[PDB]
């Protein structure tokens, strides 16, 4: 029995599943920070579920098999090309930004669905909130135009006006010279090309436009590189604080039912990510769209519904 109005009528109430431990948590840090390690540690000590940061092919891992699809069939963008040529003429930068924002929206919806369906909390990297820091840095560096950030703002408003902000935001603070040293030690040739101005703009955006705004509706734990090495103090701070200022205490069973209906049916989650506004960086011609869609339909288990593909090996098709 899939969740719906009938399930809510009969037995399904998700308020009873909350055990003070749900506490959706998001960790934010500058490129090449220790946040991924820190976020993973928090999930293991609190017993929550960890969500690796959503990349280009995050949506590929949740549909069909977990294997990613071709770049032209999924994302039509690459981060390496952005690092090599941030001012590429084919508008790759804003396409990358928009695809990553949509991936983050889908991941946030999945995490909310898991939390509302099981009660077990989740831990996230950079979410739909604070995703705008890369947009701001890219605009200030001249990589994208102003119409791109207007489109991003419209999509972000229409999409994020429908979800609950995280209970606790955890920030790991690392100086720019140290993070550049970490980039040099990393060894990735494409990551070597990141300029200091880009990182400084990123950093300026996080403190200036994100920390105070989440301080007014969430709980902030600003941490440095040294004091984030030990996760015991981080966890202790996590239990010590009590959330009483956000919208979460104001929710009830009916709002939870509405949000649970919203988080499932991902087509409704991603509805406003394809609004009919035509920017050359993301708009696609009819012929290319038709060709790419026909190629996608020719993927092995993608022509029909998940349970109706004989090529994969689905049987009893004539009676499903």
């Amino acid at each position: 029995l899939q969740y719906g109005p009938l399930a809510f009528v009969l037995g399904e109430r998700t308020t009873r599943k909350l055990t003070e431990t749900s506490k959706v948590i998001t960790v934010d840090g500058n490129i090449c920070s220790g946040k991924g390690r820190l976020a993973r540690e928090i999930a293991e000590k609190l017993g929550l579920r960890h969500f690796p940061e959503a990349g280009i092919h995050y949506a590929d891992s949740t549909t069909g098999d977990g294997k990613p699809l071709d770049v032209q069939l999924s994302g039509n963008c690459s981060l390496e090309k952005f690092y090599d040529d941030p001012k590429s003429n084919d508008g790759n930068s804003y396409r990358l930004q928009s695809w990553l924002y949509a991936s983050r929206l889908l991941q946030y919806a999945d995490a909310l669905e898991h939390l509302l369906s099981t009660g077990q909390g989740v831990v996230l990297e950079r979410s739909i909130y604070s995703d705008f820091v890369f947009l701001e840095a890219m605009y200030r560096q001249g990589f994208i135009r102003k119409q791109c950030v207007e489109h991003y703002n419209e999509v972000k408003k229409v999409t994020a006006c429908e979800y609950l902000p995280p209970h606790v935001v955890v920030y790991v603070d690392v100086p720019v010279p140290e993070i550049q040293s970490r980039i040099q030690k990393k060894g990735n040739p494409h990551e070597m090309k990141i300029t200091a101005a880009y990182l400084q703009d990123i950093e300026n955006a996080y403190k200036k436009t994100f920390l105070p705004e989440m301080s007014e509706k969430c709980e902030v734990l600003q941490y440095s590189a040294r004091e984030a090495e030990d996760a015991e103090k981080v966890v202790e701070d996590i239990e010590y604080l009590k959330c009483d200022k956000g919208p979460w205490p104001d929710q009830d069973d009916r709002t939870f039912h509405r949000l649970r209906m919203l988080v499932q049916n991902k087509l409704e989650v991603l509805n406003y990510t394809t609004i009919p506004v035509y920017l050359p960086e993301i708009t696609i011609g009819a012929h290319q769209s038709d060709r790419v869609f026909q190629k996608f339909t020719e993927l092995p288990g993608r022509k029909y519904s998940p349970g109706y593909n004989e090529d994969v090996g689905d049987k009893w098709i004539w009676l499903k």
């Binding site: 029909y304 519904s305 109706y308 098709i317 004539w318 009676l319 499903k320």
Partner: protein, 121 residues
């Protein structure tokens, strides 16, 4: 016409008892076959919308659609035939009971009827 106010008519009967005196439609009636075709088209469209193999996704579901359409069409045909029978019966009864309004026209032969001839030139 308007038969809503017709005398001795039950308020919510689909088929009155006097309708059973008429020959029922045959099971091979072309209208019944068209209703079955409609049900088959509904099944095909249902398969296509759900993104399933259109011809051979659900045989039980298509069979159910066809059977339901045939059943309802049979009953609808019965009611339609009964209504047309009532119309004809009332027509003939009224013509019988009002001879002065429907006189017998004096039969006339063309050899003694003068019709104007219009040449085509």
């Amino acid at each position: 016409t308007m038969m809503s106010g017709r005398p001795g008519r039950v308020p919510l009967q689909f088929l009155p008892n006097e309708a059973r005196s008429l020959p029922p439609p045959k099971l091979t009636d072309p209208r019944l076959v068209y209703m079955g075709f409609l049900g088959y088209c509904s099944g095909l469209i249902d398969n296509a919308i759900r993104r399933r193999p259109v011809v051979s996704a659900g045989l039980h579901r298509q069979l159910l659609y066809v059977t339901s359409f045939v059943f309802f069409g049979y009953y609808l045909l019965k009611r339609q035939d009964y209504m047309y029978a009532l119309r004809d019966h009332d027509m003939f009864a009224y013509v019988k009971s009002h001879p002065e309004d429907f006189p017998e026209k004096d039969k006339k032969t063309y050899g003694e009827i003068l019709e104007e001839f219009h040449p085509v030139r």
